Amino acid sequence: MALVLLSFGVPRKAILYPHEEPSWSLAKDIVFHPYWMIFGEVYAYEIDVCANDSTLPTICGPGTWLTPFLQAVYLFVQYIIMVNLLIAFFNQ
């Protein structure tokens, strides 16, 4: 679940924030939102940053249409596979 969390966070942070000098915020922002996503959050007005209903209308640019797909695959893997692998674990 932390390999799935960087599989999504490193592309999401690269695809969306491409003018990043080296920083420690590149250590949070590849781990931060993909962790809270597991716990009910979706950041719905940050998915599809080029949409009109965006809290991030400045993150729009080349390649940012990939992140709704990455995140779709992410949460499917988190909730529908890995969280139910915990539940199944805790049951048995």
Ligand X SMILES: CCCCCCCC/C=C/CCCCCCCC(=O)O[C@@H](COC(=O)CCCCCCCCCCCCCCC)COP(=O)([O-])OCC[N+](C)(C)C
Ligand Y SMILES: C[C@@H]1CC[C@@]2(OC1)O[C@H]1C[C@H]3[C@@H]4CC=C5C[C@@H](OCCC(CO)CO)CC[C@]5(C)[C@H]4CC[C@]3(C)[C@H]1[C@@H]2C
The entry of Ca ion, ligand Y, ligand X, none that residue 77 binds, CB within 5 to 8 Å by partner kind: none
Of 14 and 25, nearer to its own copies (C-beta) is 25
Closest CA to 58 of 1, 3, 9, 18: 18
Calculate ∠ Cα 33-34-38, nearest 5°: 110
Task: Dump the DSSP string for 29-65.
Answer: TTTSHHHHGGGT---TTTSSTTSSS-S-TTS-STTGG
Instruction: Please identify the residue of the shown chain whose CB is closest to the bound Ca ion.
Output: 40
Site for ligand X in 62-81 (CB under 6 A): 62-63, 65, 68-69, 72-73
Interface with its own copies (CB under 8 A), residue from 23, 39, 58, 62: 39
| CB 46 within 8 Å of CB 66 | no
| Residues at the site binding ligand X, with contacts judged by CB under 6 A | 2, 5-6, 24-25, 27-28, 31-32, 35, 48, 50-52, 60-63, 65, 68-69, 72-73
